[PDB]
Each structure stands twice: as structure tokens, then as C-alpha cells.
């Protein structure tokens, strides 16, 4: 049985990592009903968008949502993890970020307080994540210049 959207937000990181598809779905099934415009097709043409800037304003909100999706898919793309929800990398874990052991992290902490504890070094980790790939780019570069 599945706890529902964001159900494991108070669960251990391992339990939420088991239901990450659940959190992944609310990125799409909020935006499937709005792009549908099936219940919007007939109601006063296109919900009277003439002299109603809330209609455009509403539309701009829909744009922000798909724009955020594109930000996350871009990050998964430049880290070579586009197709997968869980991917391992080559970046070693610098201990200065967090000193907690594996058992304490995955069976004693929630993703919220973890993201709060590591929000300080997120940019650095992303930099290593954008950098580390670059050594794969370079190995492919060796295969390119023969």
C-alpha cells in the first residue's frame, strides 16, 4: 500500500527513497489535467481570455511549473542520469559536508532535515557533479583524438 503523494516526507530517507516515484508523479499529473484543456475547451470558448489577464496570469503559472520540471531534467541530463531515478557517480564524498555514518543517515534521518543540513554545500557538490563528468568527457576525448 502506497502512502500517497509526499507520504513518506516524515519517514526515514530509505523509506522515501523507496517511494520516490510517488513524489515524481505530482510533476506530471498536475500538468496533465491543465494541458488537457478538455473541460476547458468548451466553457466559454477558452475561458474568456480577452480582457481577462488572470487568464494569461494563470497561463504564466502553468509555464513556471513546466519550467521547473525542465530545470530538474536538465540537471539529471548533465549528470548523465537522465533515464534513471537512482544513479551512482564518481564523485567521492568529502567528510566535511556531513560526518554521520550510513546507518544513522538512512535509518534515523528524514530527507527534510538532511536537505537542511546539506543546503550549505549543495552548490559545491553540484560543481563536483558538473566537473566529475568532465573526466568522462575527457576519456571520450581520448577516444576521439585517437
Amino acid at each position, epitope marked *: 500500500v502506497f502512502l500517497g503523494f509526499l507520504g513518506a516526507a516524515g519517514s*526515514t530517507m*530509505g*523509506a522515501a527513497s523507496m517511494t520516490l516515484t510517488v513524489q515524481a508523479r505530482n510533476l506530471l499529473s498536475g500538468i496533465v489535467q491543465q494541458q488537457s484543456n478538455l473541460l476547458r475547451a468548451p466553457e466559454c470558448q477558452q475561458h474568456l481570455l480577452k480582457d481577462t489577464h488572470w487568464g494569461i496570469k494563470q497561463l504564466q503559472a502553468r509555464v513556471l511549473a513546466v519550467e521547473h520540471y525542465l530545470r530538474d531534467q536538465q540537471l539529471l541530463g548533465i549528470w548523465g542520469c537522465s533515464g534513471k531515478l537512482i544513479c551512482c557517480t564518481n564523485v567521492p564524498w568529502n567528510s566535511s559536508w556531513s560526518n554521520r555514518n550510513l*546507518s*544513522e543517515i538512512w*535509518d*534515523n*534521518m*528524514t530527507w*527534510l*532535515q538532511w536537505d537542511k543540513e546539506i543546503s550549505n554545500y549543495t552548490q559545491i557538490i553540484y560543481g563536483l557533479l558538473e566537473e566529475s563528468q568532465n573526466q568522462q568527457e575527457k576519456n571520450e576525448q581520448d577516444l576521439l583524438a585517437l
Partner: nanobody
Amino acid sequence: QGQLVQSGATTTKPGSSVKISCKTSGYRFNFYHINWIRQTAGRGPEWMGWISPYSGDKNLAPAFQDRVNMTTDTEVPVTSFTSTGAAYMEIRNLTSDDTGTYFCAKGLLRDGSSTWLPYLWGQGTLLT
């Protein structure tokens, strides 16, 4: 980061019932279990039981199975990841051999095999 405060000590003659209060802070009271353990003077200290503040499920040693009643007060929220609560411990029949030091402790991890294992202890109390 958490703290476990324990009630004041008191000496009562055998035959009557008593109550120990263990007040919590500095963590999420519903996250970690609550254990009660006694240090016997003259023999080896013995674990007594544990209870979940959230699930409410309780499991005691057979040495105190039908002689102990545990209760957990509903946690009081403090921070986004810190709450405060109260844990209560009870004994039905008192005797002279019940004399010894008592402690309340919290759990180490939230899941896994070492879930209810005592980690952070209280200052302790003395008896008759």
C-alpha cells in the same frame, strides 16, 4: 542534542505503587523509543522494557511482564524537527528487593535492527 530529564527521587515503603516521570526535549519524541532499565545493587543490572511513543506498542521482559504499566504522553512540538514529551513508568507490587537505581533512555536509530536500543540516558533516580 537531545536531553532526558527525570523526576525527583523518593523513598516509599514496600507494598504501595509509585510513578516515575521522564521528560524529553531536543529531538522528536515520537521518533525514538523509550526504554526503562534498573541497576541492581548486588547483582547484574537488568533491562525492564520499552514502548513506542508513536506506535504505542509495548514489549516488556518476562521478569516484569505482569508487574509494569507504561504510558507515553502525546509529544509537544517545538521546532520543525524537535518535540517534547513525557514518559511514565509504574510498578504494582513493591518490595525490599526492588531497591536500586533506575534510568530512562531513548532509541538510537529510527529503523533497522538497532531501533529500540538505548542510546541517550537520564541522570537516574534512587529508591527505597
